[PDB]
Every structure is written in C-alpha cells, then in structure tokens.
C-alpha cells in the first residue's frame, strides 16, 4: 500500500516540531488500512492519519500530458517514537 515516503521542505519542517510524517499511499486505500499498514510495517503505533488527494498537471506544450495523480497520507506517530526512513 505504501509506495514511497514524502521528503519535502513543508513535511520536513514539521516532522521535527510535531511527529507528523508523510507517505505516498495507494489511490484506493482508506485511513483504516493506512494506519494498519504503517503499524505493521514500522511498528511505531500510528495515530491520526490524514489523507489528501492530488490532481494531475495536465500540461500542454508544442503535445499534452498528465502527471499521475496520487494520494498522500500524513501520519501522526506517538510521542517518543520516530520513523527511520
């Protein structure tokens, strides 16, 4: 279900202050499955998942092309524990 972790400035500036980590998850997965996947994939007692769907760019040049819309999940890991990455 988990494809790759998100590594951007906005998510890295909050993974330190708070305990929120970003992941790029499958399109047809819900929070109940995301929590269990990160749980029995890292063992960090994930709480408070938040999902968000993105859209394709659908750019056009001189030719058209979309950019594979996905869904990103922000998990709020328990205090004291962190994800290795």
């Amino acid at each position: 279900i988990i494809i790759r972790p998100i590594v951007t400035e906005k998510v890295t500036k909050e993974s330190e202050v708070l305990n929120r980590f970003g992941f790029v998850v499958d399109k047809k997965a819900n929070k109940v499955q995301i929590k269990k996947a990160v749980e029995a994939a890292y063992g960090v007692t994930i709480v408070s998942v938040n999902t968000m769907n993105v859209r394709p760019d659908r750019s056009t040049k001189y030719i058209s092309g979309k950019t594979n819309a996905i869904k990103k999940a922000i998990v709020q890991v328990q205090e004291g524990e962190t994800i290795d990455f």
Binding site: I2, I3, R4, P5, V7, F85
Partner: protein
C-alpha cells in the same frame, strides 16, 4: 518446486517492493536488479499456476 517450498517462495521473494522503495528514496547501486526481480516474481507466479 513441490508446491510447498514454492508457494511461500513466491511470497518471500517479493523484495521487489522493498528495493523499489529504497530506489525511490535514493538511487541504488545497480538499479537493473529491479527488473530482474520483477520478472523473476512473474516466472514464479507462472510456474505456480502451472503447478
């Protein structure tokens, strides 16, 4: 084969979706192993359905 050491092998050899995550986080030394394991798992599935 024997349908017992292979049914579990086709599931334990799925390090393809760990090497893929490793490569997505950072480029691995030999990226051409991804295609190799992606076709080996297909060979295993074919042999498993053929029994």
């Amino acid at each position: 084969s024997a349908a017992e050491l292979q049914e579990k092998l086709s599931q334990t050899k799925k390090v393809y979706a760990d090497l893929k995550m490793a490569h997505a986080i950072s480029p691995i030394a030999n990226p051409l192993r991804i295609r190799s394991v992606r076709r080996t798992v297909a060979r295993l599935a074919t042999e498993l359905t053929k029994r």
